[PDB]
């Protein structure tokens, strides 16, 4: 549980800040400068540069995104994603990791053999540096008109130590041997226009001077030219610090890498700190050439940078993203189809609620803006739809992305579990939520729950019982119980496979035909001896289908009370 | 529909970049410097400042978040959100707009009158500057020990022209008249310690020299001191450009506002360009004192800056946020209840998928990271949970937020949870799914099922259970006792214990034979119905054998009683 922070305020903490120290283990975590290294960059210029052209975009939805999906893309979902990206304007598209996944291999084979790749589109495939994986990656691109082969190895301080147990030279050699293998394989495959991309993986946790060394050495192997450049792709595999620091890193690399005219400098930001878009836009101002991301920011854990956000951050400040988002609804509808994950309600530009105003005040200002625009448009013999957009609270004309401005005019599971320790089966929440419709407070809701499932002792009251279970696995269990039927003390008895069966059969003898449809039980604290909650759904005749709830210190008794509760609900 | 861009490349555009001009109407949109002004700050210092203290936080969930919801919070939802924020450690909470809505007025009365406000907590209320509204904002607050009155009016180039059709002088008087009224009203209620917050609303669409001018003006009326400071809140009402320019804007206001030592400088970013967190973090290094936001990014349109991301971004780089997030799921569940909007699967720190790894090589590197951390704790006679987190792909120990790392395995219409329920009728508890996933990691339906049987169902060593007699009390809350016949590494022994049901009894029985089984959790469900009906039981326990390990055990049987007993045996045996 959540414990109010209660430790001493910092020394020199303002009188007007009453915040207390928390007990979170901050000391397991270090500043970025200490975890990795301090900023090497003298005379940054990214903070003074405003973006005025589209980067080169590369969409990694088919590999990076797909790898991150609970339900990965079927071959049809892939074609549909591929085709959306092509039709939006993307010229570079990561289509798989052929050497690690047969489905990836077959998909690559499919778009090449089907003739599915437009003439201005380059496909990109991911590989690790092992010779047998490079080989198999080239195998998969066989007969491609042009391909990016993207090889990588982890270079961070952490990984060198704990993943590879390798020093700097050994780790540069993984990368440069990969590059040598790449040059070899490309000569073995004529006619395909081979292009290379190298990532120092976990770049954000790597010494810059070192990343430059590995990169430069890899460039020396490939021998790129201004005509036939290499891509150095520099990922925030984990987003580790603030975007200005990423950007300092990008500017430093851009300035220090050898043979810069032959390098396409590429960014691959993840969103661990919630700042992937910022890292990209500042990194772009820092001298990157290219950005890898996904539509709506799909990718492991927090995701890759959002391509859509980036593109429309350009459009809404007067820069052509060179990608069509004139119908963001279709884009979103297809991305959700392919990924089987929703775009959040608040996601920039695409989310359900982003062109909505609930505030009466905001709606008035929007309309006052919209009117001025029409007054200026009628006074210029003009279509408003071509005027400079000037509307408070709306950054863009919703129409420009195929949307519209919306001027818009029970908590059972939560409260029962939070306040009561009760995990109600879904169908029970449903059944009971209907009952609570006749707002009801938490204290109030509970009184109604108790009155419905816990209190009634008529027509059925269970007084006590003797359970005689078979000692042997699979034997039969006997119950004798003392019950009251409409006040009337009665003995009942039954046999069954276990005690709840025995009790249920026993009930037949007093005019309750009961059949267990569903049953759940859970602990109610930690510990050997804790209370149990039991939930029984039963059809009950003398034929209504009903839930009962039982709470008791025993698994058995809870379950028995759950049956009594059902029977009394049935009546 | 979507048509490929097909316009010409830009002039200068490199041969290796084949993109085409699109038909998007960019001409309807201008650079920020043209839309608003050029913000030049050649001598800025925010890029060289790393954050080393938590800001003063203010939570606006009950106002900016609430206004933004499809379904506004009921009184109960309001109260629940307010209590969560107190309990996390927020000391300033904006509780509503009580002059604008009766439900907000009512809420503010409810908390004041029922004594819900801690001594170290200062409630905040929003108001516009119309004197009837300022009066009603003070009335709402009658009998509060302290409160921040937050008044605002819009000051942007666009609204001054199209919304107000007004002079600079005109629009500034709206503000200073609001301030005057606040001062006169604060005198009518001596029982409350009043503080003021002023926002030039749509700040990011406003000339800086004008924002300063209006704020300075307001401060002259209110006359704050280092001991009674004013708040000046600078909203990115619409997030209009990149967070560096916002940061420049803050550093300049921090350096140039009159009476700076009597100013608490507050930031209030929205997320229209998806960079609200960056704005707040860069703006804080720029010299701000305070940040207004919402848990999980709720609020108007794209939302207010996420307080959880900000606070845990401090935590994970070694700065104490002074807010507890150590059960981020309790926070998530509560926020979802209150807002009735879900926290996205990939939301930083909190989304369902942020502590998972699907990648085989990530999974392998995570394990190597964990093993290496463990060898270092043993070498140092230390708790590994106490030491420097050093695991690739995981910025934090998920346990530090009450979460669990999950190596998610792919099952050949797929997924472990889904295949178990459908093929075998088992609803595995989430933490069992995680645990068993890890077993696999260390896949067809058959491989998965057989792996499952091999882990949890099959083992008869160390412990096996032949038979038992359970003696239940007839009367409720009586003792059950148990004798059981059991083979311990093949040697038949006899065991004895008592407990509140035969589960507990059986667990206590096993302690005489060198198994310390401490039940942490327990679940049971029906499989099938009738005479071909069975019970699935799952038990979580910390188990020690004659070194302690947390494991699940699964048991399946016709009896709800014997299923549970099987579960305990499965548990003891998984631990061995
Ligand atoms: Cl049973
Ligand atoms: Cl029990
Ligand atoms: Zn990646
Ligand atoms: Zn706001």
UniProtKB/Swiss-Prot annotation, chain A:
Origin superkingdom: Bacteria
Stretches for region Regulatory domain: 456-571
Subcellular location(s) of the protein: Cytoplasm
GO cellular component terms, semicolon-separated: cytoplasm; extracellular region; plasma membrane
GO MF annotation, one: magnesium ion binding
Catalytic function, reaction form: 3-methyl-2-oxobutanoate + acetyl-CoA + H2O = (2S)-2-isopropylmalate + CoA + H(+)
A Pfam family annotated for this UniProt entry: LeuA_dimer
pH-dependence annotation: Optimum pH is 8.5.
Cofactor: record remark: In the different crystal structures Zn(2+), Ni(2+) and Mn(2+) have been detected. The divalent cation used in Chanchaem is not stated. Mg(2+) was used in de Carvalho. A fourth metal ligand is only seen in the truncated enzyme in the absence of substrate.
PANTHER family the UniProt entry points to: 2-ISOPROPYLMALATE SYNTHASE (PTHR46911:SF1), PTHR46911
Free-text domain note: Has two major domains which are separated by two small subdomains, that are themselves joined by a flexible hinge. The N-terminal catalytic domain forms an (alpha/beta)8 TIM barrel and binds substrate (3-methyl-2-oxobutanoate) and Zn(2+). Subdomains I and II (separated by a flexible linker) make a three-helix bundle that packs against the C-terminal domain. The C-terminal regulatory domain includes two variable number tandem repeats (VNTR) in this strain. The regulatory domain binds L-Leu (the pathway end product) in the dimer interface.
Additional record remark: In Mycobacteria this gene has a variable number tandem repeat (VNTR); in H37Rv there are 2 repeats, other strains can have up to 6 repeats.
Task performed by this protein: Catalyzes the condensation of the acetyl group of acetyl-CoA with 3-methyl-2-oxobutanoate (alpha-ketoisovalerate) to form 3-carboxy-3-hydroxy-4-methylpentanoate (2-isopropylmalate). Active on small alpha-keto acids such as 3-methyl-2-oxobutanoate, pyruvate, alpha-ketovalerate, and alpha-ketobutyrate; only uses acetyl-CoA. Complements an E.coli deletion.
UniProt protein name: 2-isopropylmalate synthase
Encoding gene per record: leuA
């Amino acid at each position: 549980t959540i414990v109010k922070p209660a430790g001493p305020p910092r020394v020199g903490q303002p009188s007007w800040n009453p915040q207390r120290a928390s007990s979170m283990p901050v000391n397991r975590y270090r500043p970025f400068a200490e975890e990795v290294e301090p900023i090497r960059l003298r005379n940054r210029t990214w903070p003074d540069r405003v973006i005025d052209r589209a980067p080169l975009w590369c969409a990694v939805d088919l590999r990076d995104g797909n790898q991150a999906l609970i339900d990965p893309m079927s071959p049809a979902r892939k074609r549909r994603m591929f085709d959306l990206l092509v039709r939006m304007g993307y010229k570079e598209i990561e289509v798989g990791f052929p050497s690690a996944s047969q489905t990836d291999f077959d998909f690559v084979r499919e778009i090449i053999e089907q003739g599915a790749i437009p003439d201005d589109v380059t496909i990109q495939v991911l590989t690790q540096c092992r010779p047998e994986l490079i080989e198999r990656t080239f195998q998969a691109c066989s007969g491609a008109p042009r391909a990016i082969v993207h090889f990588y190895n982890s270079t961070s301080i952490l990984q060198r130590r704990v993943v590879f147990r390798a020093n700097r030279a050994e780790v540069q050699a993984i990368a440069t041997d990969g590059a040598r293998k790449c040059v070899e394989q490309a000569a073995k495959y004529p006619g395909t226009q081979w292009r290379f991309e190298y990532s120092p993986e976990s770049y954000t946790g790597t010494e810059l001077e070192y990343a430059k060394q590995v990169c430069d050495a890899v460039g020396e192997v490939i021998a790129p030219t201004p005509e036939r450049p290499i891509i150095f792709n520099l990922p925030a595999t984990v987003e580790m610090t603030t975007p200005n620091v990423y950007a300092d890193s990008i500017e430093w690399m851009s300035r220090n890498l050898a043979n810069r005219e032959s390098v396409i400098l590429s960014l691959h930001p993840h969103n661990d700190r919630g700042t992937a878009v910022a890292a990209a836009e500042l990194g772009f101002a820092a001298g990157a050439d290219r950005i890898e991301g996904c539509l709506f920011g799909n990718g492991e854990r927090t995701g890759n940078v959002c391509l859509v956000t980036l593109g429309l951050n350009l459009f809404s400040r007067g820069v052509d993203p060179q990608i069509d988002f004139s119908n963001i609804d279709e884009i979103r509808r297809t991305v959700e189809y392919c990924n089987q994950l929703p775009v959040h309600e608040r996601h920039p530009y695409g989310g359900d609620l982003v062109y909505t105003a609930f505030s009466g005040s905001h709606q008035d200002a929007i309309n006052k803006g919209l009117d001025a625009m029409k007054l200026d448009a009628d006074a210029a013999d003009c279509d408003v739809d071509d005027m400079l957009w000037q509307v408070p609270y709306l950054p863009i004309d919703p129409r420009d992305v195929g949307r519209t401005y919306e001027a818009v005019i029970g908590g059972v599971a939560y409260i029962m579990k939070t306040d009561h320790g009760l995990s109600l089966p879904r169908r029970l929440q449903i059944e009971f939520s209907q009952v609570i419709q006749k707002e009801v407070s938490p204290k109030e809701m509970w009184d109604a729950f108790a009155e419905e499932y816990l209190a009634p002792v008529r027509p059925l009251e269970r007084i006590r019982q003797h359970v005689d279970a078979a000692d042997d696995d699979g034997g039969t269990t006997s119950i004798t119980a003392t019950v009251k039927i409409n006040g009337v003390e009665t003995e009942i008895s039954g046999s069954g496979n276990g005690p709840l069966a025995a009790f249920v059969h026993a009930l037949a003898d007093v005019g309750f035909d009961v059949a267990v449809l569903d049953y759940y039980e859970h602990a109610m604290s930690a510990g050997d001896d804790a209370q149990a909650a039991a939930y029984v759904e039963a059809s009950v005749t003398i034929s209504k289908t009903v839930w009962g709830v039982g709470i008791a210190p025993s698994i058995t008794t809870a379950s028995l009370r759950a049956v009594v509760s059902a029977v009394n609900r049935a009546a």
